Amino acid sequence: TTPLVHVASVEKGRSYEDFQKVYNAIALKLREDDEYDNYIGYGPVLVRLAWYTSGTWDKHDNTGGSYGGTYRFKKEFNDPSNAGLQNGFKFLEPIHKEFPWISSGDLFSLGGVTAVQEMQGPKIPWRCGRVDTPEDTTPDNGRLPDADKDADYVRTFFQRLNMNDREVVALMGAHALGKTHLKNSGYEGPWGAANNVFTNEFYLNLLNEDWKLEKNDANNEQWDSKSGYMMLPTDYSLIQDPKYLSIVKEYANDQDKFFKDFSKAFEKLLENGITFPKDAPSPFIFKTLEEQGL
Ligand code: HEM
C-alpha cells in the first residue's frame, strides 16, 4: 500500500537502433493506414492513447501511469473515459507482434511520440524501460478528466499529474489534433482545420474564432465556430482564466516556444512515476521517416 517505486529496466540487450526500428514500423503504418477516421489518420488517436495511458498517474502514491502498460487489461480499456482508444490499440497490435520484446508501456508511449513527430511536431525525447505489471495493478476508472468543467477544475486536476499552469496549457495544445466523436465522448467536431499536422493552431483558434456556446446532439454544451470548429468547456476555460489566457496568447504568438514547451511537458507526462537509474541510457531522439529518406 506504500508508495511503490517503478525502476526503468531496459529491454534486454536493446539500444537506440532497436527502438528506431519500432518507431519506423509505427511511422510506416501511420503512412499506410491513411484512410482512418475520414483520412485524418491514426496520428491523433495514438497521441490521445499515450496521454490516457499516462494520465492515470497519481503523484500521491505513484499508482497508475505509463510504467505498467495496464491499458491491456479490461478494467482500463473499458474505462468510459477511454472510449475510442481501442482503435489506437488495434493499430499497435501488429507492431507489438513484430516486436514482441518491447513492453506495453514503452509501446503506448512511443506510439504517441512517433505520431507527434511524424505529424511535423517537435522532437520528443523518449526513454525506454517501462515494465509490464500484473492485472491487479490496473488503476480504477475515473482518473481521467471530465470535459464539462471550468478552469479551476482543470488546474486542480492537473496538480495530481504534477503539472503547473504552463505545462497544462502546453499539453492542451495537442487538441490541434484529431476531433471529438459524439459516439465516444458526447462531443462532436474538430478543434481546427489541419487535423493531422501538429501546429499551434489550437491557440490561434481559441483567440481568433467567434465562439458560440451551443448544445450538441448528445445534449452537452460545447463552443462552436462558424468555421466548423469546436472547443470543449475545458478548452475554452483556458481563455476565461486570466493566467491561462496569458499563456494561450504566448503560444499563439510563438510556434517555437510552444514546440519546446510541449516537448518537455509531453515527455514529463510519459515519464511520470518512473525512476531512471543513474546509469540508464540517455533519452533517445528518433529520426522521422522523412529525415531518414524512408
Ligand atoms: C482537461 C483535459 C483534457 C480533456 C477533458 C480532454 C478531453 C478529450 C475529449 C472529450 C476528446 C474526444 C474523444 C473522442 O470523442 O474521440 C479528446 C480527444 C483528444 N485529446 Fe484530449 N483531453 C484533455 C487533455 C488532452 C491532453 C493533455 C492531450 C495530449 C497531450 C490530449 C490529446 C487528445 C487528442 C490527440 C485527441 C484526438 C483523438 C482522436 O482524434 O481520435 N488531450 N480529448
PDB file of N, CA and C in Angstrom, residues 149-182:
ATOM      1  N   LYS A 149     -16.107  20.824 -17.376  1.00  0.00           N
ATOM      2  CA  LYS A 149     -15.726  21.675 -16.253  1.00  0.00           C
ATOM      3  C   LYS A 149     -15.040  22.994 -16.611  1.00  0.00           C
ATOM      4  N   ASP A 150     -14.692  23.769 -15.582  1.00  0.00           N
ATOM      5  CA  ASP A 150     -14.045  25.066 -15.770  1.00  0.00           C
ATOM      6  C   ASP A 150     -12.552  25.078 -15.452  1.00  0.00           C
ATOM      7  N   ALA A 151     -11.956  26.264 -15.536  1.00  0.00           N
ATOM      8  CA  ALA A 151     -10.527  26.441 -15.291  1.00  0.00           C
ATOM      9  C   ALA A 151     -10.059  25.950 -13.927  1.00  0.00           C
ATOM     10  N   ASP A 152     -10.851  26.196 -12.888  1.00  0.00           N
ATOM     11  CA  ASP A 152     -10.476  25.761 -11.544  1.00  0.00           C
ATOM     12  C   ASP A 152     -10.362  24.242 -11.492  1.00  0.00           C
ATOM     13  N   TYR A 153     -11.286  23.555 -12.157  1.00  0.00           N
ATOM     14  CA  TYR A 153     -11.272  22.097 -12.203  1.00  0.00           C
ATOM     15  C   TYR A 153     -10.024  21.608 -12.928  1.00  0.00           C
ATOM     16  N   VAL A 154      -9.743  22.217 -14.076  1.00  0.00           N
ATOM     17  CA  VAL A 154      -8.580  21.837 -14.866  1.00  0.00           C
ATOM     18  C   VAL A 154      -7.293  22.020 -14.072  1.00  0.00           C
ATOM     19  N   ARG A 155      -7.149  23.181 -13.438  1.00  0.00           N
ATOM     20  CA  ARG A 155      -5.952  23.471 -12.658  1.00  0.00           C
ATOM     21  C   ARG A 155      -5.762  22.449 -11.537  1.00  0.00           C
ATOM     22  N   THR A 156      -6.823  22.196 -10.783  1.00  0.00           N
ATOM     23  CA  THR A 156      -6.749  21.240  -9.688  1.00  0.00           C
ATOM     24  C   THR A 156      -6.486  19.828 -10.200  1.00  0.00           C
ATOM     25  N   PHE A 157      -7.160  19.453 -11.281  1.00  0.00           N
ATOM     26  CA  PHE A 157      -6.979  18.120 -11.842  1.00  0.00           C
ATOM     27  C   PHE A 157      -5.521  17.832 -12.179  1.00  0.00           C
ATOM     28  N   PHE A 158      -4.898  18.747 -12.912  1.00  0.00           N
ATOM     29  CA  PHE A 158      -3.519  18.550 -13.324  1.00  0.00           C
ATOM     30  C   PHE A 158      -2.479  18.590 -12.216  1.00  0.00           C
ATOM     31  N   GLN A 159      -2.852  19.080 -11.039  1.00  0.00           N
ATOM     32  CA  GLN A 159      -1.895  19.093  -9.941  1.00  0.00           C
ATOM     33  C   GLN A 159      -1.589  17.646  -9.546  1.00  0.00           C
ATOM     34  N   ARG A 160      -2.538  16.745  -9.788  1.00  0.00           N
ATOM     35  CA  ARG A 160      -2.333  15.336  -9.456  1.00  0.00           C
ATOM     36  C   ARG A 160      -1.270  14.723 -10.376  1.00  0.00           C
ATOM     37  N   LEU A 161      -1.093  15.310 -11.557  1.00  0.00           N
ATOM     38  CA  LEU A 161      -0.098  14.831 -12.518  1.00  0.00           C
ATOM     39  C   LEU A 161       1.161  15.692 -12.425  1.00  0.00           C
ATOM     40  N   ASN A 162       1.232  16.497 -11.369  1.00  0.00           N
ATOM     41  CA  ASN A 162       2.357  17.398 -11.124  1.00  0.00           C
ATOM     42  C   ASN A 162       2.639  18.354 -12.278  1.00  0.00           C
ATOM     43  N   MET A 163       1.579  18.903 -12.864  1.00  0.00           N
ATOM     44  CA  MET A 163       1.710  19.856 -13.964  1.00  0.00           C
ATOM     45  C   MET A 163       1.264  21.248 -13.515  1.00  0.00           C
ATOM     46  N   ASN A 164       2.046  22.270 -13.857  1.00  0.00           N
ATOM     47  CA  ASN A 164       1.689  23.641 -13.497  1.00  0.00           C
ATOM     48  C   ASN A 164       0.908  24.312 -14.629  1.00  0.00           C
ATOM     49  N   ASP A 165       0.592  25.594 -14.464  1.00  0.00           N
ATOM     50  CA  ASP A 165      -0.175  26.319 -15.475  1.00  0.00           C
ATOM     51  C   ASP A 165       0.403  26.237 -16.885  1.00  0.00           C
ATOM     52  N   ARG A 166       1.699  26.503 -17.026  1.00  0.00           N
ATOM     53  CA  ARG A 166       2.329  26.472 -18.345  1.00  0.00           C
ATOM     54  C   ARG A 166       2.300  25.082 -18.955  1.00  0.00           C
ATOM     55  N   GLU A 167       2.552  24.077 -18.128  1.00  0.00           N
ATOM     56  CA  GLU A 167       2.545  22.696 -18.592  1.00  0.00           C
ATOM     57  C   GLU A 167       1.148  22.280 -19.045  1.00  0.00           C
ATOM     58  N   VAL A 168       0.132  22.720 -18.311  1.00  0.00           N
ATOM     59  CA  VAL A 168      -1.249  22.400 -18.654  1.00  0.00           C
ATOM     60  C   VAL A 168      -1.628  23.017 -19.998  1.00  0.00           C
ATOM     61  N   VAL A 169      -1.370  24.311 -20.154  1.00  0.00           N
ATOM     62  CA  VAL A 169      -1.708  24.985 -21.401  1.00  0.00           C
ATOM     63  C   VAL A 169      -0.943  24.390 -22.579  1.00  0.00           C
ATOM     64  N   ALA A 170       0.336  24.079 -22.374  1.00  0.00           N
ATOM     65  CA  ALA A 170       1.141  23.482 -23.439  1.00  0.00           C
ATOM     66  C   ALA A 170       0.569  22.120 -23.845  1.00  0.00           C
ATOM     67  N   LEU A 171       0.296  21.263 -22.866  1.00  0.00           N
ATOM     68  CA  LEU A 171      -0.245  19.937 -23.162  1.00  0.00           C
ATOM     69  C   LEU A 171      -1.572  19.985 -23.912  1.00  0.00           C
ATOM     70  N   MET A 172      -2.428  20.935 -23.553  1.00  0.00           N
ATOM     71  CA  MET A 172      -3.731  21.040 -24.196  1.00  0.00           C
ATOM     72  C   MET A 172      -3.614  21.377 -25.677  1.00  0.00           C
ATOM     73  N   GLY A 173      -2.461  21.903 -26.082  1.00  0.00           N
ATOM     74  CA  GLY A 173      -2.261  22.255 -27.479  1.00  0.00           C
ATOM     75  C   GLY A 173      -2.349  21.051 -28.397  1.00  0.00           C
ATOM     76  N   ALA A 174      -2.272  19.856 -27.820  1.00  0.00           N
ATOM     77  CA  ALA A 174      -2.363  18.638 -28.615  1.00  0.00           C
ATOM     78  C   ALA A 174      -3.752  18.539 -29.232  1.00  0.00           C
ATOM     79  N   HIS A 175      -4.691  19.340 -28.734  1.00  0.00           N
ATOM     80  CA  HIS A 175      -6.037  19.305 -29.284  1.00  0.00           C
ATOM     81  C   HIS A 175      -6.119  19.910 -30.675  1.00  0.00           C
ATOM     82  N   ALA A 176      -4.975  20.302 -31.224  1.00  0.00           N
ATOM     83  CA  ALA A 176      -4.965  20.806 -32.589  1.00  0.00           C
ATOM     84  C   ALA A 176      -5.181  19.555 -33.438  1.00  0.00           C
ATOM     85  N   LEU A 177      -4.901  18.405 -32.830  1.00  0.00           N
ATOM     86  CA  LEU A 177      -5.004  17.106 -33.496  1.00  0.00           C
ATOM     87  C   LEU A 177      -6.352  16.399 -33.386  1.00  0.00           C
ATOM     88  N   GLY A 178      -6.747  15.743 -34.473  1.00  0.00           N
ATOM     89  CA  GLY A 178      -7.980  14.973 -34.486  1.00  0.00           C
ATOM     90  C   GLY A 178      -9.288  15.698 -34.247  1.00  0.00           C
ATOM     91  N   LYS A 179     -10.194  15.030 -33.541  1.00  0.00           N
ATOM     92  CA  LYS A 179     -11.505  15.600 -33.268  1.00  0.00           C
ATOM     93  C   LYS A 179     -12.235  14.829 -32.184  1.00  0.00           C
ATOM     94  N   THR A 180     -13.352  15.387 -31.735  1.00  0.00           N
ATOM     95  CA  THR A 180     -14.176  14.712 -30.752  1.00  0.00           C
ATOM     96  C   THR A 180     -15.200  13.948 -31.594  1.00  0.00           C
ATOM     97  N   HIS A 181     -15.606  12.773 -31.126  1.00  0.00           N
ATOM     98  CA  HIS A 181     -16.588  11.962 -31.842  1.00  0.00           C
ATOM     99  C   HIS A 181     -17.770  11.752 -30.901  1.00  0.00           C
ATOM    100  N   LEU A 182     -18.953  12.198 -31.317  1.00  0.00           N
ATOM    101  CA  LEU A 182     -20.138  12.093 -30.473  1.00  0.00           C
ATOM    102  C   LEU A 182     -20.305  10.736 -29.794  1.00  0.00           C
TER     103      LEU A 182
END
